[PDB]
Amino acid sequence: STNLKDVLASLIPKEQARIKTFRQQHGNTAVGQITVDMSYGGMRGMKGLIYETSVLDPDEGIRFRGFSIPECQKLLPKAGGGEEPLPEGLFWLLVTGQIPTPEQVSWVSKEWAKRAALPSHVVTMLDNFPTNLHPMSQLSAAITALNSESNFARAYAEGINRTKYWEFVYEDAMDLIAKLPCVAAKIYRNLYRAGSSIGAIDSKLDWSHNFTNMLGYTDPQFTELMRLYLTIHSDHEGGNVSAHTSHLVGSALSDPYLSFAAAMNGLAGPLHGLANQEVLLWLSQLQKDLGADASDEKLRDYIWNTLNSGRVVPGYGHAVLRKTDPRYTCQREFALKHLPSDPMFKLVAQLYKIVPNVLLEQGKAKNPWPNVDAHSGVLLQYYGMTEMNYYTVLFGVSRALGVLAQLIWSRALGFPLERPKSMSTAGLEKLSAGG
Amino acid sequence: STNLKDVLASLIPKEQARIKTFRQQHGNTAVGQITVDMSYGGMRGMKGLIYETSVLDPDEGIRFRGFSIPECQKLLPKAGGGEEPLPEGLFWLLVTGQIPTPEQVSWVSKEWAKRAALPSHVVTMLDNFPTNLHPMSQLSAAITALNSESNFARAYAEGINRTKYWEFVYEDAMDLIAKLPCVAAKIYRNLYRAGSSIGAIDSKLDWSHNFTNMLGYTDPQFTELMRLYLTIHSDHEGGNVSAHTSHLVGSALSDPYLSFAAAMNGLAGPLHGLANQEVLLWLSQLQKDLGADASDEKLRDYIWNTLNSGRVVPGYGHAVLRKTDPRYTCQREFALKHLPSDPMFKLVAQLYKIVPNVLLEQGKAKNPWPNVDAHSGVLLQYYGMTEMNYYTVLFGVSRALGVLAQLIWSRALGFPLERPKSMSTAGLEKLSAGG
Ligand SMILES: CC(C)(COP(=O)(O)OP(=O)(O)OC[C@H]1O[C@@H](n2cnc3c(N)ncnc32)[C@H](O)[C@@H]1OP(=O)(O)O)[C@@H](O)C(=O)NCCC(=O)NCC[C@@H](F)C(N)=O
Numbered sequence A, B: 001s002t003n004l005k006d007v008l009a010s011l012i013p014k015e016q017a018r019i020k021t022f023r024q025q026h027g028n029t030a031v032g033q034i035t036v037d038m039s040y041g042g043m044r045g046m047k048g049l050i051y052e053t054s055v056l057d058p059d060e061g062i063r064f065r066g067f068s069i070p071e072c073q074k075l076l077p078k079a080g081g082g083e084e085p086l087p088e089g090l091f092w093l094l095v096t097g098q099i100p101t102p103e104q105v106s107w108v109s110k111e112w113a114k115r116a117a118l119p120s121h122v123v124t125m126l127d128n129f130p131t132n133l134h135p136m137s138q139l140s141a142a143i144t145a146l147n148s149e150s151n152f153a154r155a156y157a158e159g160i161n162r163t164k165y166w167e168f169v170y171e172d173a174m175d176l177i178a179k180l181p182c183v184a185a186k187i188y189r190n191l192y193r194a195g196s197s198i199g200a201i202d203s204k205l206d207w208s209h210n211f212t213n214m215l216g217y218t219d220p221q222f223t224e225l226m227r228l229y230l231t232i233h234s235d236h237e238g239g240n241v242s243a244h245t246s247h248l249v250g251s252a253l254s255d256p257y258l259s260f261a262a263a264m265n266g267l268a269g270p271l272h273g274l275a276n277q278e279v280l281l282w283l284s285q286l287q288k289d290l291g292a293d294a295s296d297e298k299l300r301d302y303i304w305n306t307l308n309s310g311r312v313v314p315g316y317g318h319a320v321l322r323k324t325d326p327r328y329t330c331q332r333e334f335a336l337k338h339l340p341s342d343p344m345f346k347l348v349a350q351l352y353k354i355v356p357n358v359l360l361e362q363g364k365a366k367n368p369w370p371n372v373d374a375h376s377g378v379l380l381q382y383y384g385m386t387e388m389n390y391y392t393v394l395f396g397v398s399r400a401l402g403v404l405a406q407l408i409w410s411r412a413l414g415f416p417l418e419r420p421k422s423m424s425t426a427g428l429e430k431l432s433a434g435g
């Protein structure tokens, strides 16, 4: 009775028509200007893509189809006896723009359990990888290796009419989301619980729950942490590295597997998703240098040393946000309720009072406030997941949700190849006169 | 005596200063405007990146550091007794902006031979991949898997000051370029010459030549074809999918291996580099449907069928070019001189007279002229490399040259995170009023 595919089939045509007419009336309307500095500056401040699933406000933070995080916490279906929103429902909301019912949500859950299966070549590959190969690298390679199963790649090669692309993107999106956790978990076990198995998927549990079982975690609060984690890391508008990467690559008709794997390569950058891991490594050195209960003056000292050494303070600053990230806050709130006395937490808490000030003092960062990465590993560490090099993988798993949600839309709406014009410094100097 | 690293060390500071002052004077100068339609249209027509290595003219075609293809053919060092430009020299030109000497060129050649070596984990991986896994997929996975050797990743993790990034990017760029051919060739042999070995690198040959030997080709004209192939496919300004992908991903500090592998995922799209393979598959069906010597009326018919079926005619059209691609011409010229009587060539030739007209007639394509992909496989087929699914790999190998050339520059000049602002249809309608 529930079928997202049928829902989308009705939704698509209405949106097509709506954009059609809009463009008819305003396609030539200018929404902005490009300056030299924006070009030199990684397009900062440039309105350059259409991304439907979420929109980030520099002051207010992210909105998913119009709903802020608190709204989601409050409207999205939760697990039986749960408090955290199920990621399944977030997906539904991104995809349809509507809040789902719990019945709808459980359908996603069954769908994802039904579709989870790995081909032997991928299993073999993971099991043969060396332990010194980074988790994100093993993840990306494995997703790329899964493209032999692409339904989209196969229909394209069969000559499918372009109007049906979305249909195949949809299938691969659902299959990929379903497989992610098994891939991710196999890496965790091969690297950290060598000789053990991830086991089987229980068609009866939610996605997060099957994930945590494959990861080998029993604590129920952990399961709750996971549901939240996976929901809040899902999407962050379209201009962020990982999302933009998936967009750009999918724009050339590369299948979802390939687009996703490229995005992961983007997420693995220190200035992007890798910050989650970097925050923890930074804290570890901290506590190692100074030792567990530091003084504010010593924290300042340690911050300055990093800055003076031509390095960044991980988990602070943002390309678009201008205030403290609601994702950070949302994590703080969870810590306060569940592990208020953790020393690491306490350390993170203390940094909140110091870091922004130092940054302000330094005078370079546009946004001195923390971002989501400043607070995530601390929560994970608490429950026993101390492998910091694996943290980004979790972020990867979550991000699939948003990026793949949009991906279907991009193909449904017929977005073309992303191909902007480049310029050389010399060509640009000429264009103007030069300086 | 020759050391590109030392040359760059002198070059870098001058460029820094030059951009500095320019920006001082014109950073706020507007170079363009953004309209609704550009946003909806994959940034078509938007000046959005700074890319130093090459600049594409919509009428004239690509210029590499100011030199057109004919100029390169004419100025770049050639092999002993050769006629085709060595890719090594093209690299030097991209990187320094200066035409190299043959002595310089031979240094690149030795450097690339010295640095070529694959780690066992990567070898193992390739050898375990299934035959149904696409060549581009095996390539991308393998490059990602090589990041365990990244010098840049390692120095970043050690806390290197940001001013030294280029130095490590440089090393990885050279190591990666050196390894590409071995990777590429191992895939070719595992897939198509099962049981044989790629052999060893001869520190005495040029890069293209060691490549063709590992591929198992003896014809000297083939070697010449390769040198040309690899030179002309090298770079195509910064807004193309693969280049932009590498740029965006490297912008987050992901290492060159990861940035390159993501670019490859971009290249593997049907609307991008995969067209080379698609052209051949299209021709094969053609000749199969119609049979070897077709009539113009039947060629038209066949073109129309494709178009009417919601498909693209591979190898025709371009996002920026408005006239026939000089890369196409350059290939035609080679065919005319070396395999003028090939039936396939002849077919390609015949299409040149028909395709653009049909396209013009259809009224959709902005550019009805052929692009580089319309002419490449035909040349390869002639020499015995009939595995069409492998063609994109060659394009991949070549592209490393341009993208990695720029990559060093991006980090030398301190380009920041690429992060434009996205918008939703609803947010945009509001911004205006809506249509
Ligand atoms: C996220 C970030 C790359 C945004 O960059 P951008 O919009 O260019 O930042 P900006 O305009 O404030 O930069 C102004 C100056 O302040 C510097 N600065 C910014 N954030 C800084 C930080 N956390 N520590 C030190 N210096 C910093 C920045 O590097 C720049 O210096 P240069 O002039 O020499 O280029 C940046 O604030 C940063 O480097 N953060 C540290 C890494 C991090 O936390 N990454 C995870 C981000 C998270 F949202 C995610 N998962 O994507």
Ligand SMILES: CC(C)(COP(=O)(O)OP(=O)(O)OC[C@H]1O[C@@H](n2cnc3c(N)ncnc32)[C@H](O)[C@@H]1OP(=O)(O)O)[C@@H](O)C(=O)NCCC(=O)NCC[C@@H](F)C(N)=O
Pocket: A414, A416, A417, B240, B270, B271, B272, B273, B274, B275, B276, B307, B311, B312, B313, B314, B315, B316, B317, B318, B319, B320, B364, B365, B366, B367, B371, B372, B373
């Ligand atoms: C390269 C290309 C994606 C540029 O796209 P774009 O700048 O959006 O093209 P455009 O502005 O002319 O498109 C106008 C219309 O003509 C259509 N059209 C363009 N080229 C076409 C072709 N070769 N066959 C059929 N229809 C085509 C295009 O799809 C579009 O239709 P919609 O309105 O329904 O979107 C495009 O011309 C194309 O689809 N080419 C066929 C694939 C190909 O040859 N790829 C290799 C390109 C090569 F340069 C490379 N290696 O990257």
Ligand SMILES: O=C([O-])CC(=O)C(=O)O
Pocket: A235, A236, A239, A240, A241, A242, A319, A320, A371, A372, B419
């Ligand atoms: O929005 C961005 O630029 C980075 C970020 O926080 C994310 O991708 O979650």
Ligand SMILES: O=C([O-])CC(=O)C(=O)O
Pocket: A419, B235, B236, B239, B240, B241, B242, B319, B320, B371, B372
């Ligand atoms: O320039 C582009 O958009 C595509 C192209 O021909 C290339 O990347 O070689």
